[PDB]
Amino acid sequence: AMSCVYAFGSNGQRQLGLGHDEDMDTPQRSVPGDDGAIVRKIACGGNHSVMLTNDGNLVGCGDNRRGELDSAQALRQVHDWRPVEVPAPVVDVACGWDTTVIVDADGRVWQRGGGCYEFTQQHVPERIAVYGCFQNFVVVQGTRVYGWGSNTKCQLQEPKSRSLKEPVLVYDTGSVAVDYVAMGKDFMVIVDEGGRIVHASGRLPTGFELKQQQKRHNLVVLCMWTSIHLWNARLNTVESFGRGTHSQLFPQERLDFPIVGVATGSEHGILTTANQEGKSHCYNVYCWGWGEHGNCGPQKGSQPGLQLVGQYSGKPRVFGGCATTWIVLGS
């Protein structure tokens, strides 16, 4: 029972937990204080990163100049992985640009950062999950989807209202339960357990016609800051919608390997495929999109196409951040 964590990419604020502030272009072993408890989720802000283990503990590293990590206001940066002070054991975690949001075992939602150095409870009206990106957060319970934060693009409600401090009702189904919420910079895509898009607010990237996508079944929706990506298991490919200025658009070339996992960072994608060519089956992890900081591998030119960053015997879990890539392995 052990989860190894490998990280690479942007590291200017030591948000990779490697101890140093140098950008990496190959997977580096990121060892916390424990490294014995298994990893549940790795949420990433702009310059900070938090790691939620399955024991309710939450460690973090990176920038703290906006209070996204520790309550010590004189603590500007957390050098290595450090325990994040929480009012109660954490069940789920999410990060905004300079904020951190947790959901504890008591069902309470807490938010720190964005100038606020103290964990402040967000009062939101059975499984409870939290999702966040940029300047927005969302809490999902059953069929109801509550969200707060920015609203300059009508990602929460009507009309354009700069910001909402109090959690509002973003969307209700209100029959089939909501599985997750894939959110970008100023937009949002709500998906049910069936696998179909049920709602989408904010400004969606070009080409993404909402009414046409709501008729499709069994989709896995991923979101970068300025693009939406749809994992189509049936066709074994990823459909991308957006400007694609820096190769964020997934290569429409034939994928011979079976896709078994897809994740996205701020402006890059992480693909996990099944390599079955040997006597033993393994897993290839690819990266596509903007990778100047090495978050896509040694080739940092953001050229179109997949880039192989690693190959593992066990199926890895991957997480994306702001020009950072996290690969989690099971020993």
Determine the interface stretch with a copy of itself among 5-13, 99-107, 119-127, 167-175 (rule: CB under 8 A). Answer: 5-13
Rounded to the nearest 5°, which phi and psi values hold at 144?
-80, 140
Q: Which of 123, 211, 234, 279 binds a copy of itself (CB under 8 A)?
A: 279
Query: What is the DSSP code (8-state) at residue 237?
Result: E
Instruction: Rule CB under 8 A: say whether 65 interacts with a copy of itself.
Output: no
Among residues 94, 219, 228, 249, the one that binds a copy of itself under rule CB under 8 A: 249
Q: Closest CB to a copy of itself among 124 and 259? A: 259
Q: How many H helices and E strands in the chain?
A: 1, 26
**Backbone dihedral angles phi then psi of residue 210, each to the nearest 5 degrees:** -60, -50
For residue 2, the minimal CB distance to a copy of itself (Å) is 4
Rounded Cα distance between 250 and 244, Å, is: 9
- CA distances for 304 relative to 97, 268, 287, 324, angstroms: 27, 11, 10, 18
235 binds a copy of itself (CB under 8 A): no
Site for a copy of itself, residues 164 to 203, rule: CB under 8 A:
none
- Identify the sign of the CA torsion 24, 29, 35, 40: positive
Residue 311 C-beta: closest distance to a copy of itself, Å: 4
Q: Which residues contact 146 (CB under 8 A, 6 or more apart)?
A: 124, 125, 138, 139, 140, 167, 168, 169, 170
Return the range that interacts with a copy of itself (CB under 8 A); candidates 51-59, 138-146, 188-196, 294-302.
294-302
Please say which residue, 11 or 111, places its beta carbon nearer to a copy of itself.
11
Q: Which is nearer to a copy of itself, 47 or 213 (CB)?
A: 47
Please tell me whether residue 43 binds a copy of itself under the rule CB under 8 A. Answer: no
Query: Residue 85 interacts with a copy of itself (CB under 8 A)?
Result: no
**Which one of residues 7, 28, 171, 325 is an interface residue with a copy of itself (CB under 8 A)?**
28
Residue 123 burial by Cβ neighbours in a 10 Å radius (0-12, 13-18, 19+)? exposed
